[PDB]
Amino acid sequence: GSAKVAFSAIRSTNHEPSEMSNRTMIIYFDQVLVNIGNNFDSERSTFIAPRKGIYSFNFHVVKVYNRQTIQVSLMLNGWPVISAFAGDQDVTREAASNGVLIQMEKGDRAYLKLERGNLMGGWKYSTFSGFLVFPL
Amino acid sequence: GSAKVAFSAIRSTNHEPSEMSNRTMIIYFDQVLVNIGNNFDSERSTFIAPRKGIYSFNFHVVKVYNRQTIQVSLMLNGWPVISAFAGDQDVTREAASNGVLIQMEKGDRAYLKLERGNLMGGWKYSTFSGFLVFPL
Amino acid sequence: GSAKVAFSAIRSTNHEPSEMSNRTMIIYFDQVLVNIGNNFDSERSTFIAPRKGIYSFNFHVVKVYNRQTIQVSLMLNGWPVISAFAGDQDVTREAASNGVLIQMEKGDRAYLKLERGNLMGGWKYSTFSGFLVFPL
Ligand SMILES: *[C@@H]1O[C@H](CO)[C@@H](O[C@@H]2O[C@H](CO)[C@@H](O)[C@H](O)[C@H]2NC(C)=O)[C@H](O)[C@H]1NC(C)=O
Ligand SMILES: *[C@@H]1O[C@H](CO)[C@@H](O[C@@H]2O[C@H](CO)[C@@H](O)[C@H](O)[C@H]2NC(C)=O)[C@H](O)[C@H]1NC(C)=O
Ligand SMILES: *[C@@H]1O[C@H](CO)[C@@H](O[C@@H]2O[C@H](CO)[C@@H](O)[C@H](O)[C@H]2NC(C)=O)[C@H](O)[C@H]1NC(C)=O
Numbered sequence: 001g002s003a004k005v006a007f008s009a010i011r012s013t014n015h016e017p018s019e020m021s022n023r024t025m026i027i028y029f030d031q032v033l034v035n036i037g038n039n040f041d042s043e044r045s046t047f048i049a050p051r052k053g054i055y056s057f058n059f060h061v062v063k064v065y066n067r068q069t070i071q072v073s074l075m076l077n078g079w080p081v082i083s084a085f086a087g088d089q090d091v092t093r094e095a096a097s098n099g100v101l102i103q104m105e106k107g108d109r110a111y112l113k114l115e116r117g118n119l120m121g122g123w124k125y126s127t128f129s130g131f132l133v134f135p136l
Numbered sequence: 137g138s139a140k141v142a143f144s145a146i147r148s149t150n151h152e153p154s155e156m157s158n159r160t161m162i163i164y165f166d167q168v169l170v171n172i173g174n175n176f177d178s179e180r181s182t183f184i185a186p187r188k189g190i191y192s193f194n195f196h197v198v199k200v201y202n203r204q205t206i207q208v209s210l211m212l213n214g215w216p217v218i219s220a221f222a223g224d225q226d227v228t229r230e231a232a233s234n235g236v237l238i239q240m241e242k243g244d245r246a247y248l249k250l251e252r253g254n255l256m257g258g259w260k261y262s263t264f265s266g267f268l269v270f271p272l
Numbered sequence: 273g274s275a276k277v278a279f280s281a282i283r284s285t286n287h288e289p290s291e292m293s294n295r296t297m298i299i300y301f302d303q304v305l306v307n308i309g310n311n312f313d314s315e316r317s318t319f320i321a322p323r324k325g326i327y328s329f330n331f332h333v334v335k336v337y338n339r340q341t342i343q344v345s346l347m348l349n350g351w352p353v354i355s356a357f358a359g360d361q362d363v364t365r366e367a368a369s370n371g372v373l374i375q376m377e378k379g380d381r382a383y384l385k386l387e388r389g390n391l392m393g394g395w396k397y398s399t400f401s402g403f404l405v406f407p408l
Pocket of ligand 2: 153154155158254256
């Protein structure tokens with residue numbers, strides 16, 4: 001029970017970044033598909049760990065042609081753990097994708113941040129998900 | 137026991153799409169590596185959920201140069217949950233990859249569908265896998 | 273307890289391949305983020321399964337422009353289970369990414385091998401992780 005913890009969120013439209021998102025560079029997901037434990041904060045697109053354990057995260061951030069390459073980082077309490085990268089071309093939607101397992105303590109925060117480049121043109125089809133693999 | 141549910145499948149050759157696959161646009165995996173619970177239907181390349189829970193899925197669909205870009209969607213009972221994308225070039229094999237967690241009920245179906253483009257030239261090296269994270 | 277098994281490793285610098293790595297073509301990860309059970313051998317960048325079960329693996333191998341395309345394979349006791357691919361360009365860091373579930377027996381070994389191409393220029397930002405989904 002207290003060890004069933006999972007979330008899943010997607011970007012459902014190609015609408016543009018909000019003003020606050022330009023300031024945080026935190027990547028926003030409007031449609032929450034799964035939120036067992038209610039530990040993902042959808043306003044802030046941030047997972048907050050309810051207990052000590054090993055957590056898994058995956059993300060795929062989709063961009064269109066927009067005169068920019070990007071770097072996306074999964075952030076743990078404001079420090080980048082992993083990054084992914086995408087280029088700039090008009091042939092196809094393209095994704096920055098990566099995933100990892102990390103230890104988190106209670107209250108630890110995980111979210112995605114655009115380190116380099118921007119998502120003007122939208123980031124429809126973007127995904128972010130994660131779950132407690134086991135408590136420690 | 138009834139909560140150990142996992143599958144894994146790959147495309148082992150670069151052979152071309154069958155006639156029926158042209159009609160469904162459902163992506164076929166010939167080699168099943170894991171099938172605990174026997175809940176993946178290999179003929180139809182479809183996972184059928186044996187019980188209510190949160191399930192994880194991952195896929196990577198590999199294409200060669202074939203004058204087409206692709207969009208691949210994970211389908212839940214015929215509705216696309218996530219998509220991934222790949223372009224068209226002759227430099228390298230390229231993948232449409234994405235993954236997500238979703239709630240499924242008993243009898244719910246998960247499979248992959250080519251929404252845009254085709255896989256003439258084969259989709260060798262393609263992978264699809266998933267598992268019950270926990271029952272609900 | 274004996275069913276909590278997880279690792280996570282990354283490549284933290286853009287330093288070049290060592291001589292021994294040129295001989296094995298085994299991809300090395302210097303920073304180990306998670307190692308529950310201590311079943312990942314960091315010197316050899318190899319996970320050694322402590323018991324029979326279904327294990328999940330994910331990897332993303334990041335390259336720079338280096339006049340080479342690559343193929344990366346997850347190896348199970350020296351045989352490639354899945355592969356991923358990346359091309360060669362100077363626009364952006366690019367990744368060969370894939371993931372899968374496999375059955376392993378006790379003592380089985382999982383590691384990543386560069387089947388085609390090389391990682392001159394470094395493979396900073398590369399990731400490799402995996403966990404026991406359940407014992408069998
Ligand atoms: C968020 O930031 C982008 C830039 O990253 C803003 O779009 C730019 O606006 C400037 C100044 O008006 C123009 O010169 C460019 O046309 C835009 N640049 C790009 C790269 O598109 C965008 O409007 C901002 N959105 C807000 C604050 O809501
Ligand atoms: C499946 O569909 C493809 C097209 O998506 C078929 O290949 C095409 O066949 C047409 C008509 O004969 C030709 O004009 C083209 O040479 C082919 N197109 C492409 C894009 O390759 C393919 O044969 C079909 N396979 C079946 C029904 O088994
Ligand atoms: C590991 O291998 C690469 C080649 O894969 C070595 O770099 C090459 O060295 C040769 C011979 O001296 C040169 O002709 C080229 O400049 C290099 N090739 C490439 C593709 O960069 C590298 O030094 C080796 N490193 C070792 C043994 O530590």
